[PDB]
Each structure stands twice: as C-alpha cells, then as structure tokens.
Paper text:
As a negative control we generated a [name]-1 variant that prevents UDP-GlcNAc binding by mutating Gly461, which is located at the bottom of the UDP-GlcNAc-binding pocket. Kinetic measurements showed that [name]-1 [name] has similar kinetic properties like wild type [name]-1 for l-Glu and d-GlcN6P synthesis. [name]-1 [name] did not respond to UDP-GlcNAc treatment, as expected from the crystal structure.
In the first step of the HP, [name] synthesizes d-glucosamine-6-phosphate (GlcN6P) from l-glutamine (l-Gln) and Frc6P, releasing l-glutamate (l-Glu). [name] contains two domains: the glutaminase domain responsible for releasing ammonia in the hydrolysis of l-Gln to l-Glu and the isomerase/transferase domain, which catalyzes both the isomerization of Frc6P to d-glucose-6-phosphate (Glc6P) as well as the transfer of ammonia to Glc6P to produce GlcN6P. The active sites of the two domains are linked by an ammonia channel, which forms when [name] engages with both of its substrates, l-Gln and Frc6P.
Author numbering:
A (entry chain B): 2 to 227, 244 to 293, 308 to 681
B (entry chain A): 2 to 227, 243 to 294, 301 to 681
C-alpha cells in the first residue's frame, strides 16, 4: 500500500500540475502495491478556485498506476486548466490481499454520495466489523467491503454530533482514532475544511514533507495536548507532501517530519501543527541506464557490498567494527545462544550464514521463520541474543517476533535496510546494511548485504581468539576481493541468458545444494517462483536419497551447486545419483573444477572464494537466471503478480 | 543385500527341504530390492550324506527369486531326496554394486573352480582393488567383477598358507577380515570344514536364529579372545541355526536370535555356536515379531496395508505406556535416564526424511510441555555445519530402520561431545538402538512398504508420549495432559473414521491424475503435514508436490497461485485458524480454487470451498496424524491410477561400476 498527497498553499498550480504530481507520487510508491490506485482532488470548473473546494472528485480504477494515469486524462468533464492557489489532493495505491481489486474497494474511500470526507488508509482496522454495525444503525449505508470505509463513515459521524459549530478537523480525527483498533496511517480531506489535511499514524509509517523558498519558523514542531506551527515566516508560499514513504518526497524536497504513534498532524492556514534533512539522493531511486530496477539492483551488488562494509572493515590491519554494536558487543558475548528471526529472503540470509556464525561464535544458532516462530510460542530466555533481519524493518511477523522476544528479556538486534523503521527503533541495537533503497519487489542486494552484515558480526565475535586469527584473515581477504569477483559473475550474464532459453518453457525446476549452498538453492528457488512463476523448489542435496530423488528423470530440469569446500565429495555423489536417474543438470561450480566441467554439458563457472562467502557468488547466477526466464516468458520483473514488496499487514 | 543360511545339525532334512527353506528365506528378503540371487549347498547324490560333504554345488541366476526356484527343481543331475543329518546351505539376494548383474557376478562367490570356499556378502569392500592385485600376484585368477570375489580368494590364501593342518575356520576368517576395508556381512562355507558356518560383520546387520526341542546351554554367549562358553543343546545334538541379515527371514522358524556386533566372528563347529573376538557376551533374546506382520494379507500392497492398519499400529505404540485408567504415561525405556533428561537444557531431534518430519510435527508440543529449547535438525546438514553440542543436550535420533548413515553418524557425533542420546527406532538390534544411551522402540511392527506410513504416525505418537512424561510433575499442565491423553484414547477410532473417507480421496486422485504439480499449504501443527504429504506424493506418485508454509505465501510463493496450479490447504480448528483463513482468502483472491482438508464441523469453509476433505476433530497437537492420512492415501491412489507399483523402490543408488 502507498499514500501520497500534495498540498500547495498559495503556490498556484493548475489542475494538470496537481494530478501529474499525485500520479508521479504514486509511481514512487507503486512498488508497495499495484493492484489498484486512485486520486482525490477538488472538482468543479469555476475560474475562481475558492468556489470549487466544496466539490470533491474521486478518480479510482483497477490495475497499476498507469491504468489510473490514463483514466485521469481524456476525461470530458474535468477542465485541467483551472489555477488553484490553495488545494489539497490525496492519492493511494492499494495492495488488494483480499477480495477483488475493484475501484469501489480502492482508496480514497468516502463517507457519503457527496464526498464530505475522503480518507486514504494504510493498514488494518481490527474492529471494523463492530464499527460497521454501529454506523449502519444510526443511518449510514456502506458500499464497499474494505475496512477503510468504516473510517470515512465514522469521521462524518463525529462531525454530525459535534458540540460546537467550529470543532477543528483535529478534534474530529482524534475522536475517530479513539474508536479504531489495530494499525493505520491516515490522510483526511473534507469539503468543510478546505485545504486542510490531517495525518495521524499508529503502527504504520507516515511523514510530512515541506518545501518553501522562504525561511521556516522552526526545526522542532512541539507536540500539543488537548511559536507552535511550521510555516514560512514572512510569506505564505509553502508546499506540503504527505506520504507513507520517503521516495515519493525526495524528488520535491528532502525536508520531512517523521511523525510518531498517535501524533495527529494537521495543516491549517498552510501551517503544520502536531497534536496528541533526508540522507538520500534521487539517483538512488532511479533505474539509470537499466530497463528494470531488478536488473540494476543485481548489477549494483559490487557497489552495495562495498557500502555495507564502508567504515566498518579495515583490510590493512584486518579489523571489523560495527558501530551499531559498540555499546552491546561485550554483553552479547556473555550470551549463550543466537536466534535469527526473519521472513522469506531475509530468512535465507540467516540460513546462508548459520554455519559460519556457529563456527566463529561457538554458540548455538537457531534460524526461525517469523510466522512459525510465533505460532509455536518458541521458548526464549534472557541470555538469548535475537537477530531480526528485515530489509524494510516493518514486516509484520518479524516485528511481532521482536516484541515477543523483548517481553522475555532477550537482547534484540536489528539488521535492517531502512533507518527509522519499527525494527530498527525497537531493538536494543541496530546494524544498517546500507545497501541503498530496494525498489524491485524481489530482494537481490538486500540478501547479499544481509549476508555480508552477518559475516562481519561473526568476525567481531572471534576477534579475541588466537586460534581463529588466520581464519579471520582468510575471510576478510575474501571480502576485499568479493566486489571484483561479483563483477566476474555478472560478466557471464549472456551465458546465463542462453541457458534460460532452454528452460523458459518448462513447468518445474529442482535446485539442489547443501552446506553453505542450502541457502543458495532455497533463495534461487524463491526468486524463480516470485518473478518467473515456474514451480522451482530447493532440495537439500543430502536429502535426495530419502525420497525426492524419485522426481528426477530425463524430463525434469535440475540445477545443482557443487563448490570446492568440505562437501565437494558429497555433492559429487548427489550429482552421480541425479545422472543415474537420467537427469541432465545445470551445475554451478568453480572455474578450476575441471572434473565437473568435463563430465557436465551445461556449467556455470564462478570464481572461487572463501567457503563461507561462496554463497554470495553462487546465488547471483540464479538471480540472473530468474530475470532472464521472466523476460522470456513475457513477464515484468519489477511487478510480479499476486503480491508486492514488504509484508506489513498480518 | 539379503543374506540367509540354514544349518541343520542332526535334524534330518532332505535336499528338497533344505532348498525350499533357502528359497523361502530369500522370499522374506525381496522387499528391499535386488537384481540376482543364488544358493550354495552340498552336491553329490550319494545316499550317505557323510560322503557328499566334499562337493559344493552353486545355483546362481540374474532375475527374481522365483526364477531361481524354477532353476533349482530344473536340475536333471540332482537328486532332491538325499537326506542330510548335517548340512549348511547359504542363500543371497544381490543389489549389484561392483560388476553388472549376471550369473557370474551373483553370490555365492567361490574361491576356485572346485568351490573349496564360498561366501555371500552384503556391503562393499573398499580396498578390493589392492587385495585383487595381491591375490593375482600370488597366482589366483578372478572370474567376476565383484569386490566379493576377493573375500573368497583371500580365505583360500589364508588356508593355503596356514601353519598347522588343524587351523580353525574362525582363525582363517579372522585373518581375512583383518585385511578387508569397508562394510560387510559375511557367511562362509567350505569343504574343508563340513557342516561348519562362520559369520562376521562390520557395519552391516547379521543375526543368528536358533531352534531346538532340547534345552540350550545358555542365553548369554560369552565372547572368546585369542564346553561352558558356547551355545548348544545340552543333552542331545539336534539343533537348527539360521544366519540372516534381516529378522524377517528367521521369525517363521524361531524368535530366539543373536545379534552380532562389529568384528564378531561367530562359528558353528560340531553344532555348537561360539563367538570369537581378537563378562562381555551376546544375548539370546526373544523377538516379538510375527510372520503375519510381514505379509500383505488381504491387501493388494504393503503400502495399502500399512496405511489402513494404522489404527492398530498406533495402539501398539501406546501399549504398556499410556494408562487410560488413571491417565499416566510410562516409557520403560527411559526409566534409568528420565531423571538426567529432565535436568538437561535443550532437546535436539536429528533425523532424515519422514523421520525428520516427525520431529517437526511434534516440536511445538515438546516446546510447550518441556519448556526447553527444541531444535529439529536434518542429519545431513547437522553434520555439514559441525553443529555445537554440549553435555547438557538431550539428542533424539529418529530412525525406523535404525541404520540410516547420516542419522547414525550424528549419533556418534553427539556422543563424542558428551550429550545424552536417545534412540527412537522401529528395529530391534539396529545400530541406533544399541549406541544410544537409551531408546523408545516405537513398536509399530515391521514396515515393509517403500514409503514411511505407520512409522511416521508411530514416531509422532512416541514423541508425544515423551512430552507427556516430561511434564507429569507440573500442576498447571494436568488439564492439558488429560486432554492430550483423551485424544490418544480416541485416536484409533478417529483414524478409522478418516480411512472410511477413502472414496473421497479417490475422487480427488482422479482430479489430480493429469496434474504435474500441486502446492500443499499449512502452518503450525500442520507445517509437517505439508512437508510429509508433499514428500509422499513425490516419492510414490512422481509429481512435483511441494509443501509451503502458509505464513510464507505473501513473501513470494503466492506468485504460483492461479486458476491452473492445484492447491491443497490444511485448515484445522486450533489457535491458527484465523491465520489459515487469511491464507485461504489470499489463494482465492488470485484465482486459486484449492482443496481444503478441514474439520468435519467447519461449516463456513465447507460451503465456500467446493471440494473439502472433512476429517474429524482431535486435540490440536494430534491433528497432524489425522490430516496426513488423506495425503498418504492420495499419493497411493494417484500412483495406482498411473499404473505404478507402489511397492517397487524406484530410488536406486549410483550407477554400477563396471571397471
Ligand atoms: O524476494 C524476497 C521478497 O522480497 C520477500 O521474500 C522478502 O524477503 C520478505 O518479505 C522479507 O522482507 P523484509 O526483509 O523487508 O522483512
Ligand atoms: O517416505 C519416507 C522414506 O521411507 C524416507 O524418507 C525415510 O523416512 C528415511 O529416508 C529413512 O530414515 P530412517 O530409516 O532412519 O527412518
Ligand atoms: N558389493 C557386492 C555386494 C553388494 C550387496 O548385495 O550388498 C556386489 O556388488 O556383488
């Protein structure tokens, strides 16, 4: 889901400049939800913009944002030339996880057939059914099945029973949130409060951008309780940008005000009051010269790996320092167990580093899927160190596992790629993988950056063990050489594309690996599932003989991973078993693995690295393969079907 | 792959009776798989059996045992009526490793063209290359491409180079095994030791059955190192011995067996059984196994039998352990260790395949009732990572066979680090049941089918019973324990209720008959049900079935759902019900039309879902047993519809080395 609104106060914008700003704001947020979209602006065709704020127009349509961009245009009733000196427009892209992604279920919702109050909502109201029966008995009719409509039909109920003729828009919103349960990030608009916007949040992101050629009256808005507002000093020119993400606002200004839970922001008379510089460059959210975000993010891994280690890894003296842990590493080493909790590819990053964490810490290491971790009420203890891997820092199950472990007194550590996220804030300490914004739905650099981050932690946990000095040096030299080796893998892009032309027509593919490459075959199978829609499955190589090997014949595509580590011989037995079953597999192996290369037709030869880093090099070909397969099948790699990025609700 | 030898000592048997006994023995060993079989016995047609001892006859053939039985009676020079007061016959089914299947590569392997020594072998001699070069340099010509022939040629080399004319058959074999490297189970026969047998093993099962109408000298054979120290009938000579690599070949003649251990050399000399080794001893123990337990009966396949007899195998697993009169649990196998176990700080379950799924299926209740960390590891990955293990860990090893290599090596790994080891096995005398500090035999009866059906559900019940032991002193858990135990009391009848829906499963099998993939989705107690169901359909049906954790759909796998991909969802009445419904709304929202396995009374889902398999409600931590059975049957029926032999093992090892 995504939220974006544009409030231009005494900065004249025509109706086309606003609609093109609402759509352009949703395009920056489309990667969070692309099942439907909508916009809410002022209607009417009066040359005097003042006589139009009493008419709200809603243009909602099913599909991505490009389906709404064309629905907004070529309309016969909306004159796009009216100049508005003061105007508020709200927009929203929706991730329809339930029901149909129809225009009636898309946002902004409405409170009646005349649009007196329209709201855009990100989250879930855990008591909308009770609010739907109370509002229906008073005389309100419902049109949609979404839980957002109960917020629109309720802000009007507080307006129809107010005590004074001029109850501020904040008071109406404050009474609403008091009746809403669960999480929500809202942005209201009403004809009765022209140009006024109200932004409240609870368990969901919501910031407010500001731009103005004049000086701002302060840089610390004081929270109020039922010399106070943020506004231009001498003049009135100001532009606000409500949004649930920082990408929809960086293009216009890098000055935002990250709200907090229960903070009811409100723009009145062009002044921002709360009741109760961004460190990002636009180039980071631009595809550049690549045709897709995913392809850029795969080919930027040489850089993102370097950024993850910047200011943390010194190769002249072989020292590792994660500043985020400087005030806890001592207490972390007196703990007795590591628990890694995450979902999806973040969980695979844990599987990919579990062995080296066990090796260098000598502690038990338990890697848990967040959803199952919660279902079982897993035992947690005060001397447990619990890591929570989340590219977004907002994943529902991972965040709930965090609060679960905090309640039991465990030491909590956040491995995130989003500063200010829930997981990064609520953990005792934090490590920011610093991989840059990830716009593609599939995690590519986030995986390898989480990988490297956990290896760097492992290197801190053994920096006082004489017997492990050489092992640490081996690994750090591998990290020094890792960016260049990633480039070597990317230079085989064309070779991967050719092998993809031999598989795009297949329905299934088994990816097999063990040891350090169990995670590789799991993550590779998830990528091929997510963007290619082929039935790809990861199979632990050691488990073939126990049943799954029966599925292999000359028709079943197979990809195997055979690297030069301590499992090489065992991986050769699995390969011999596959061949005996008439399998003709593609083997990802080391360049110097002459034996494997001679006896196998299709081989992807990757350069050798340290055994505990090879997983980074062996997964990249499967990222590229998934990409090429998706292209061959006519799919879009930046907008896979049936889901979006970051699972923040239930 | 299968060994069987029958030694009748002063128990008269005709040649026909001996050969019928050997053939019958191999028939109990076919269920594993094989490519060739053979027998070795005394030739010659002299009416006096004493003179026929210097003529060993061999009949080996590539094919099934039935073809061998036809070749036995199809011998024009052989008289089947000669009566032998003393005779040793050996038989073998082969699973070719070194050398292609053929008569020459079949066992018994001989030491020369006159059959002075013959040997049947299960396993692989790793150093068969070096040994072959040595014996060839001494003047021994080989005729087969098997590693086994080196054993036959080597024992003759020891005989030819013996120091005294009366060196014992044992001493020769001792010198042979001292040069062998690898795994083996061996039975020797020779004209120079008429009527004598020598059996030895290293890393491969070998047992000895005994029968006599006369009292035996002992039930504990003492080991002899290099009249009161061997096993024999006391007042008379008559006795029968049965060497075998699987008790299934012995149980119809006797239930008194001796399980040999690595490097034991058991010898029968003058009808007396001794056990040599370069007060320790081997016990004569009684097996509770019955011939009926390894027969199909009225069922058309072992897979069908073992699925439909699960009401009975569940009861056997609980027999003598769960008291439904005062609701108590007692696992006698743990009596001398339960106190140390409760002072430990972590449970680790280590297994492969379906045994591993049994750990996943009971992890939550073990966590709930023990309140200890519970870690469930795949044995192969457990070894690759060198997982940290400590002296206060309790490590469980789940293995129907008790011989799985990675699980066994995980056991030895954990023993080296001082952990308390517990075996959950279905095979008396197996490696894991022995080497563990204690065990809990699951008592499900033998599993003859290729896939694990009753073994899974009996392991499931066994770990629940252990969980109930670990909390029998907690006041706050008395209610929960009673609930679980009333569920176990009602479980056999609920399994029958599920088996009565077999017709509903067949209908689903015809709907998936033509399908290439199917996603099986579940969470919580039914995560394991997904993994186990998907493995069964992979193993038995050969279609791409995959178990997906329902909570992980939104993180990528949901992209496979459309109007074409078959989906099976498991939704039960437990604390994860609302979350399972949400996963169902996500699947449907993406044009998915899934089959839902749910509770009988879940009226909401039954109306909103077209096809639903409606299983009866049980305790939440027991539902996995009921909801997996429809998936067992589904795999079975799909296979039948597609013309597959469900009792045929398609999983073959690496190719045969031809050299
Ligand atoms: O390709 C991976 C997907 O993007 C998805 O599997 C993702 O990894 C999880 O949803 C966890 O995301 P977070 O790291 O933000 O928690
Ligand atoms: O369908 C299950 C198969 O029979 C297989 O998965 C089995 O579970 C193990 O591979 C063998 O291990 P154990 O003999 O130790 O159980
Ligand atoms: N390795 C021996 C015996 C194999 C077996 O049957 O266990 C052979 O190939 O003949």
């Amino acid at each position: 889901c995504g939220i974006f609104a544009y409030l231009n106060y005494h900065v004249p914008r025509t109706r086309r400049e606003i609609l093109e700003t609402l759509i352009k704001g949703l395009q920056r947020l489309e990667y969070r939800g692309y099942d439907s979209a909508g916009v809410g602006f002022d209607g009417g065709n009066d040359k005097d913009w003042e006589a139009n704020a009493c008419k709200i127009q809603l243009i909602k349509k099913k599909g991505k944002v490009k389906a709404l961009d064309e629905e907004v245009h070529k309309q016969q009733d909306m004159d796009l030339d009216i100049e508005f000196d003061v105007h508020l427009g709200i927009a929203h892209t929706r991730w329809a996880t339930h029901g149909e992604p129809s225009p009636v279920n898309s946002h902004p919702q409405r409170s009646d057939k005349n649009n007196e109050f329209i709201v855009i909502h990100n989250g879930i109201i855990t008591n909308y059914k009770d609010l739907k029966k109370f509002l229906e008995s008073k005389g309100y009719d419902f049109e949609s099945e979404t839980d957002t409509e109960t917020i629109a039909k309720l802000v009007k109920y507080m307006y129809d029973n107010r005590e004074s003729q001029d109850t501020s828009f904040t008071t109406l919103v404050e009474r609403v949130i008091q009746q809403l349960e669960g999480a929500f990030a809202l942005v209201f608009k009403s004809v009765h409060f022209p140009g006024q916007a109200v932004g409240t949040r609870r368990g969901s992101p919501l910031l407010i951008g500001v731009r103005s050629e004049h000086k701002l009256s302060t840089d610390h808005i004081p929270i109020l309780y039922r010399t106070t507002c943020l506004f231009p000093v001498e003049e009135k020119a100001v532009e606000y940008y409500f949004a649930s993400d920082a990408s929809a606002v960086i293009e216009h200004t890098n000055r935002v005000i990250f709200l907090e839970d229960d903070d009811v922001a409100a723009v009145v008379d062009g002044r921002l009051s709360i009741h109760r510089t961004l460190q990002m460059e636009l180039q980071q959210i631009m595809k550049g010269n690549f045709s897709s975000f995913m392809q850029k993010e795969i080919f930027e891994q040489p850089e993102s790996v370097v950024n993850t280690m910047r200011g943390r890894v010194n190769f002249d003296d072989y020292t590792v320092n994660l500043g985020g842990l400087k005030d806890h590493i001592k207490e972390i080493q007196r703990c007795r167990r590591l628990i890694l909790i995450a979902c999806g590819t973040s969980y695979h990053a844990g599987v990919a580093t579990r062995q080296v964490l066990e090796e260098l810490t000598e502690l038990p290491v338990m890697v848990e899927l967040a959803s199952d971790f919660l279902d079982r009420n897993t035992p947690v203890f005060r001397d447990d160190v619990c890591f929570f891997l989340s590219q977004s820092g907002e994943t529902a199950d991972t965040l709930m596992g965090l609060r679960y472990c905090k309640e039991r007194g465990a030491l909590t550590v956040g491995i995130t790629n989003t500063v200010g996220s829930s997981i990064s804030r609520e953990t005792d300490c934090e490590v920011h993988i610093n991989a840059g914004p990830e716009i593609g739905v599939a995690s590519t650099k986030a995986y390898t950056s989480q990988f490297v981050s956990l290896v760097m932690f492992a290197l801190m946990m053994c920096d006082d063990r004489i017997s492990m000095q050489e092992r640490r040096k081996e690994i750090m030299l591998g990290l020094k050489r890792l960016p260049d080796l990633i480039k070597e893998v990317l230079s085989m892009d064309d070779e991967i594309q050719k092998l993809a032309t031999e598989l795009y027509h297949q329905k299934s593919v088994l990816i097999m690996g063990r040891g350090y490459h169990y995670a590789t075959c799991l993550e590779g199978a998830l990528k091929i599932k997510e963007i290619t829609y082929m039935h790809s499955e990861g199979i632990l190589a050691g488990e073939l003989k126990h049943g799954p090997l029966a599925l292999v014949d000359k028709l079943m595509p197979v990809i195997m991973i055979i690297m030069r580590d301590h499992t090489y011989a065992k991986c050769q037995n699995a390969l011999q078993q596959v061949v005996a079953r008439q399998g003709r597999p593609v083997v990802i192996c080391d360049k110097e693995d002459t034996e494997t290369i001679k006896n196998t037709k299709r081989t992807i030869k990757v350069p050798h690295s340290v055994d505990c880093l090879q997983g980074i090099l062996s997964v990249i070909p499967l990222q590229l393969l998934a990409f090429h397969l998706a292209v061959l099948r006519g799919y879009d790699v930046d907008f896979p079907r049936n889901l979006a990025k970051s699972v923040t609700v239930e």
